[PDB]
Ligand binder design. Structure first.
Ligand SMILES: CC(=O)SCCNC(=O)CCNC(=O)[C@H](O)C(C)(C)COP(=O)(O)OP(=O)(O)OC[C@H]1O[C@@H](n2cnc3c(N)ncnc32)[C@H](O)[C@@H]1OP(=O)(O)O
Ligand SMILES: CC(=O)SCCNC(=O)CCNC(=O)[C@H](O)C(C)(C)COP(=O)(O)OP(=O)(O)OC[C@H]1O[C@@H](n2cnc3c(N)ncnc32)[C@H](O)[C@@H]1OP(=O)(O)O
Ligand SMILES: CC(=O)SCCNC(=O)CCNC(=O)[C@H](O)C(C)(C)COP(=O)(O)OP(=O)(O)OC[C@H]1O[C@@H](n2cnc3c(N)ncnc32)[C@H](O)[C@@H]1OP(=O)(O)O
Ligand SMILES: CC(=O)SCCNC(=O)CCNC(=O)[C@H](O)C(C)(C)COP(=O)(O)OP(=O)(O)OC[C@H]1O[C@@H](n2cnc3c(N)ncnc32)[C@H](O)[C@@H]1OP(=O)(O)O
Lengths: 389, 389, 389, 389
């Protein structure tokens, strides 16, 4: 029924690094043209562009429409942004699948984009401040990384799961090192090259082509990992080294019925067999993926053991270990090329970034059944099962 | 197959008016609870909440999830926000319907919410400003009302459509006055009572219950209308009087299969027969509804003549006249109780606001076929056809 | 040797009141024009303009020169601002006197101006804020009213003075109320008309002439003052009622040698016999007037008992009572037309505002010896003796 | 009559350089302690502290007093800041002299301090911004470098002066390069060591001692000056290389009667023989020094040819050449150790910084008569004559 004809993602930038002054719709446009080019589909055949994006403050009207127009998709197609926090990227793909499944569209470009670097500071000032100091709020932290129910950071929610699952520092640290070493190993062997579409950082005193994940760290040591101080709980266990980072990036998929891809002679990266989204306690939002994955598997008619490859988003080492511990899937087939701790976590783009890595790894090793899943702030999980053809 | 079991909207606040300090999710909570109580469905039975919202800067992580939790939808449910600018409120409902249509959900609350008053001022300040003044940008203007491709305001787009359609000042003014007069009549006659759920503005020095659309102007004259100066084009034709305003509000609908409503004893407000979204030139974005309405009639298998009631959002008199002129529907069945010029236009909530208006008027006059449509900044239209049961 | 030929002040405005959006330099230029007019002196004869001013942030290069240029003082004269906090308006007069006493000028305009309403919020942003919320600081509080050594408000130094002199709430409120009733009666009787020069607040939708002190409360009651909550110490004694307010105004004096005023046939408002400035502990800065008045009296060769009238500025009733208790002057000759609790406290202007008040009352009742004195944040006092000719 | 018993200055910091986060009062405190130590005068004997400062926004209540307290000056002493823009640090000395001349003080510490790096960005937000962007104003530019009458930067006044005196790019550049070459030669030979007092930048990760002017460029080339583009008039003649910079620093002098220096066995740096301040057209502010120096010499009884050494502040090479051309003093006795284009221009402190340079060079070469003068924004000049004893 619905297949991902092609896919592409930019490299994931570090915070205030290579994409520091790049609006997310510019990386979005590059990724949208990439998918088109890759499948051999003309921009004019796109019905709609669906892009998850959690932090658009200051970017102007509907950045998803700006991305589409800049990538050549005519003014006749439509475009919209959506937010389901970290799940956005993946959710958007399911939403475009639904556009086709109900017969409302033929071809959708879906994924997410995000510029955490470009997220601005703000204040509500229409009433005015008659007397006294007032806070300038960092919208990336307020609107993207702070739980709205308990007022604390995602990091504390990770601590909640750490304590609850009795996941020691050394255990999270071990997990972190492995994702670095695995992300570094994969990048060195050219395993991220099919998925990445170089992005040209338009300069003045030089244009720069970015085609490598700059957030991965080469030669990560356990010693350096164990000397870092806890970033959220002063006598905590979560640190900067075992937590994902603040990053920029964009990732997308080209969707169409399976019959359509056959009419066009396209070899699809996979069929979307199912997807799902379930809520959980906001305090332990990191557990999100447990219920959602299970549901997704139930809806696809598959067992956990049927999965050949898995991409479970690395928000925090504590949550990742808890996910894997509970689900019990074989660790060796999960984040084979490294995860968000090494790669990065451009919130609104991450769900599509991990779908790209899944998709191109599944083709590369010939795996048939796959699943991508992410935890979501506010206590939610999103999962999707993909099957190759 | 999918019906609108119940619906509710808060009154529409004036800018920095009744809801001046009310966060959009608060307005949404109340509309989530209203739709739930008006259909007899428990919050625990809600699977997902979808809320169109264009300006959430600074409201924290995913205001839709905040709204849902505040209203009592359990943490096991899911929520998300989406942005197709002005069509957001209506598109949510279509998106929600698709959730049930693909069997991924049973019961959904969809609509939109917006606090234009609470939109903050922002600046990207991570680099630091070594020297020189910098701009604190109004996200309301920048992210909600400015065309991202031509840099001008929506009002200019309206001017483009007036010139194009040769719509004179007097003819735009005549439409505005009638909109005010129909809204005022409607309000005096208790015609907005069913759809409105009174909202309690939690005070300190007292609570204030708001149950009336405060932006409608009583006794609007043609003289006062003709004295106003053009707001966007210095020697233009669009004024503050013949353009909608800046406003706050929320509206939603409770969706479920026709079968499910039947199992429950609910008498639905309507069956969603079709919906459609189409793009047009950003410069003449107000023509959006033409192609969109036509596409949705096509998908429903209806002729324009088949409609008994229409709600075509009045962003600007010049675009509303163009639309009506083009489509040729009977003016007498369009915005029977007044439109956005009088009622206001809380961006992300406006499509759900007009769906409420349509739906309660179809039940009260016994209309069978109705259509709701809105122009969208960036150059898009959205439309939905509803049939009574 | 040096006399005050004439003086003028603007009415004192309420915080964000009649001069809510009037830069201080506009209020200062009207006072410069009035002192000139009053003395029969032309703006081309002024050598230098000296204006105390504590909060000039954002008003642009040297506001004293902006006021001087606006008044028509030639470009060949000079002008400068100074800041000895609340004693500023009075210390500028002392400093203007000194220019003439040393032969460096013949004609000086000296006093103060302040727009507390127009003070801005600020932040040091050159280095950049990598991430996190940051404070926008009210410059009026931080630079005008917070002690820099102890970090608390001037209000807390008043509580310190209340404890140490054992001043009860009741005694302070009675002083406060008498301050209001004396001001009201001298306002109603027209005793502020001579000193005040009307200020024209330039409208758009109408020019407004301001010629009355608007912070003075009419029919102030003991009861409503008694009911107020402490404002600085949750369980203190200083309240908004018995403390001075936040205000806007300007005030000045025209100076020249006695011999010069004699050549011109000018009947001066008085001779500056002496002045003094002395420091005290910043914790009890309200006590400043004690050592400073004793020193000005000593330098004049006068006993406390030789004074006929006194203007002892009312920062807080706690400190005014203390000052009066220690000096032991007859209370009936102190602030006979009310004081700053009623009239207000536009920080840099205050010392010249009370000087104007002293001057015009000395002329009206034929008082021969007077003194003006103020307390100063930071732990200082300033006083000036004046004798009539 | 009045002498300068001792003097000291901190090295001049580069913009956002060595003193990037050092509040001005900390730099002033080290210079007050240096002057005391230098004169064998204890802080308990100081009567008053007078500090020129143009941009104190956000540093808290009267920074002059903060500096004085930090240096141990007793709370019984007084302190104030003043602002005659660029003339401030020199005016402070003339005003402190006046304190003593009139018998109100015996011992004064007077000069200036400025942290242009710490000046903040601000906005008047008390009335609120109902809608539309607002500017965050750079207080350094607005309040220190922008002319309030014509709206343009001090650099445009320099273009006015270059046009009017027909100073070519080439001649300004040759003046700029010799200013750098002379300051560098003086720094390398140890000539700034007597006047500089080392300032310790209290760090966390290490304390840094700053005792070298860091803005002076070594091996400055004419070629590099010539290639620069005009900074203020796109087709102008003033550039970043021929203009002074934005800088941080403090400087002062300790003052007492000549008879009191004699009682103490102090060998003073000089006798203040006269000073003067005169205005000029704001558009040609740079010419300030002409009438002020001519008036100061007149008051001294000196002809221009009587001076042995001159410090004429180099705001811009255009105005410094105009001054020199008009006055006609032998250029080889002016700014013999380089001037502000090389050393820097910490607005409020500059006048005291060049007074320190004059004094210590007069003592080294045995120069008997000197003069220090500066141009001032808003159209003013200040000058001081000094004779050695
Ligand atoms: C459901 C969900 O998915 S919710 C999650 C959505 N995203 C999040 O919740 C946020 C996760 N990320 C964050 O919030 C941030 O990245 C934080 C708070 C963990 C870290 O923020 P910062 O302190 O600004 O990060 P930063 O990159 O500076 O880390 C600090 C240091 O850790 C070091 N570090 C990080 N990883 C490693 C590692 N593997 N090995 C060694 N050093 C490391 C960095 O190199 C840096 O060194 P430095 O101090 O010399 O610069
Ligand atoms: C696809 C699309 O939908 S795009 C549309 C999305 N929304 C928009 O595009 C914006 C349209 N609305 C706007 O941008 C604004 O409301 C504007 C620019 C037209 C007006 O903004 P403002 O100038 O701040 O509006 P405001 O309410 O002050 O109008 C000014 C005056 O007009 C008067 N006025 C307005 N309507 C009338 C009337 N019918 N009769 C008499 N006077 C009237 C107001 O009462 C007011 O009088 P006042 O100056 O004494 O207060
Ligand atoms: C050495 C030196 O001079 S330092 C002194 C320099 N100035 C200062 O130190 C500060 C003194 N002033 C202040 O800081 C402020 O005015 C404060 C903190 C005391 C009050 O600030 P606010 O709380 O914002 O003042 P505000 O005007 O709102 O007073 C609150 C209320 O008291 C009421 N009130 C004040 N005086 C009276 C009175 N005499 N009778 C009855 N009610 C009164 C006001 O009407 C107001 O009523 P409301 O809440 O219904 O509006
Ligand atoms: C009365 C009165 O005194 S009014 C005067 C008060 N002060 C003023 O009016 C302002 C004077 N100064 C200024 O406004 C500023 O210094 C300006 C606008 C001229 C320059 O500001 P900026 O552009 O930010 O200065 P900046 O230090 O970056 O200069 C730019 C470049 O010129 C280069 N430059 C400056 N001088 C030289 C030189 N002598 N040789 C070679 N290069 C030089 C700098 O090295 C820098 O190179 P980069 O771009 O690789 O960094």
């Amino acid at each position: 029924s619905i297949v991902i004809a092609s896919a592409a993602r930019t490299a994931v930038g570090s915070f205030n690094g290579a994409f520091a002054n790049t609006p997310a719709h510019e990386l979005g446009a590059t990724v949208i043209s990439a998918v088109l080019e890759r499948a051999g589909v003309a921009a004019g055949e796109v019905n709609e562009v669906i892009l998850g994006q959690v932090l658009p403050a200051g970017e102007g009207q509907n950045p998803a429409r700006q991305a589409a127009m800049k990538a050549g998709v005519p003014q006749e197609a439509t475009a919209w942004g959506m937010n389901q926090l970290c799940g956005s990227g993946l959710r958007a793909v399911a939403l475009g699948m639904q556009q086709i499944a109900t017969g409302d569209a033929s071809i959708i470009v879906a994924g997410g984009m995000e510029s955490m670097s470009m997220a601005p500071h703000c204040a509500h000032l229409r009433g005015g401040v008659k007397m006294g100091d007032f806070k300038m709020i960092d919208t990336m932290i307020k609107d993207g990384l702070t739980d709205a129910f308990y007022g604390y950071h995602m990091g504390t929610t990770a601590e909640n799961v750490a304590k609850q699952w009795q996941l020691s520092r050394d255990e999270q640290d071990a997990f972190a090192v492995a994702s670095q070493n695995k992300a570094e190993a994969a990048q060195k062997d050219g395993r991220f090259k099919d998925e990445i579409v170089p992005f040209i950082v338009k300069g003045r005193k030089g244009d720069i082509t970015v085609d490598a994940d700059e957030y991965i760290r080469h030669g990560a040591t356990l010693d350096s990992m164990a000397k870092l101080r806890p970033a959220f709980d002063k006598e905590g266990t979560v640190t900067a080294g075992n937590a994902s980072g603040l990053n920029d990036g964009a990732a997308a998929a080209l969707l169409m019925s399976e019959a359509e891809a056959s009419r066009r002679g396209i070899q699809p990266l996979g069929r979307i067999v199912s997807w799902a989204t379930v809520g959980v306690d906001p305090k332990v939002m990191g557990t999100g993926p447990i219920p959602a994955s299970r549901k997704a598997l139930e809806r696809a008619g598959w067992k956990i053991g049927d999965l050949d490859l898995v991409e479970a988003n690395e928000a925090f080492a504590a949550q990742a270990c808890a996910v894997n511990k509970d689900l019990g899937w074989d660790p060796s087939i999960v984040n084979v090329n490294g995860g968000a701790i090494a790669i990065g976590h451009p919130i609104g783009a991450s769900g599509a970034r991990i779908l790209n890595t899944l998709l191109f790894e599944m083709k590369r090793r010939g795996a048939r059944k796959g699943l991508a899943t992410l935890c979501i702030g506010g206590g939610m999980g999103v999962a999707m099962c993909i099957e190759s053809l």
